[PDB]
Ligand binder design. Sequence first.
Ligand code: CL
Ligand code: CL
Ligand code: CL
Lengths: 172, 172, 184
Amino acid sequence: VSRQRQELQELRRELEELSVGSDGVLIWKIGSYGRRLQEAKAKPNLECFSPAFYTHKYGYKLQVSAFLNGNGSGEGTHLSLYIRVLPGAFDNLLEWPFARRVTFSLLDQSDPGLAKPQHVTETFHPDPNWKNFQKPGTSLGFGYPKFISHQDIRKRNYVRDDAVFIRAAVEL
Amino acid sequence: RQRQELQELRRELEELSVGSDGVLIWKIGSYGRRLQEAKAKPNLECFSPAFYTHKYGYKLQVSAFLNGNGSGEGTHLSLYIRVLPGAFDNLLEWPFARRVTFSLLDQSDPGLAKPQHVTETFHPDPNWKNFQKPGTESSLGFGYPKFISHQDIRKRNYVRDDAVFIRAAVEL
Amino acid sequence: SRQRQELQELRRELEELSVGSDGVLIWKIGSYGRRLQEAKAKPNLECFSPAFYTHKYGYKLQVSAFLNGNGSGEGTHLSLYIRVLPGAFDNLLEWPFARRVTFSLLDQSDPGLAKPQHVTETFHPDPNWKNFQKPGRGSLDESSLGFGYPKFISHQDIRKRNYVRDDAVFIRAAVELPRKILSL
Ligand SMILES: [Cl-]
Ligand SMILES: [Cl-]
Ligand SMILES: [Cl-]
């Protein structure tokens, strides 16, 4: 029994090391949007987390997070989006502070052949003085409290089939 | 209980099945045994792992009747493809209209002699219901009931070490 | 047993997903100090990288290391080797394996503040080395195959710079990939 469980834990860890951006891109699907939005309205600062992902194979380990009902200046009125640098297996091989351009998008879920998608996008340029980007060891989220308002999110296909797509594109 | 813990990992592995520059290579092992099973069970269809054409692309699945079906029954290998519901469907153009190239690979040492692959190409038919957006008649896929005859498959190295390779290249 | 069979099937599926990143495998060897002491006590003690495909539908390779050395490097050097393993796509490939291989022991220094001085060896696989031949049966069944460097880096040199950092070493194997085609 102990062997089968240690085996499952080993495979789960292996799967997590396979979470890697595609040309620096992570697309995070937040399902059950309708329910999760009501949970966030009942509990201020309830945060959703993406799976951890490597920017590129043997790169930085990052994690996207979202407040469906918002946080800080966006609390109760906006979707808020953040990213964090996590301790990664290959940190000693990397340049510090983390200084890669990060592009956040909330995807417009429209068929591109029928209508041009109108994604909500913002490009983050890390400040080398912010502690957030320093080598882990030697949370620290960085992002936007007012990414998209509750009124604006209903104006395009940002929510479709009770799901939203958050895109984080890291310049490699 | 653990059947679903294992099914969670199996589902994640399926999400990691992605074409290499739009290419899926599907190995059908135990050819002799499976061919005999196909002769005894005419509705016996082999399925490839499901795969994404590209990261965040269309989810497809290749299938084969080793003893053939329809007009190829008992005389040919029949090859088909289907669109399956994918996690990113709302981001894609519909109907699926990307050129698909099927090849049965000649397993000849390329350093010795030029392998003579058996190849067919098609542009997906917009009137084929399965090429339309999933969720929006026969359960059969789209393809070739007469891909290669049983006489031709025994020539060259189409069957080698009791295995055949099916290649499906999707124009990205 | 049914769940145990399922675990081994998933483990095989995960191995098929071990693919180099643009032909690159980076292998982290943790607990370096302890493993060096174990290797001093057991001369044949060999560390193995996970098996990996050079590229999707490519060659299956595996890197190996003797922390206390093998052959001419025994007791004085780290020895590095690579071998071809039976892969699912072997019958579609050119044999013998002839793609350029570059081995590196990584100097774990921040590249932005100091130039890391990696220890490197490059080679064009010799067509006469039995391992680089197509994998696969005779009455003689042994494991002596892999080509390499018995004297990759000396024990004196590995203690310089940042080759060992946080009790770990990084071994890099970069393999030459098929060239992309372009129509003019
Ligand atoms: Cl730092
Ligand atoms: Cl995908
Ligand atoms: Cl150390």
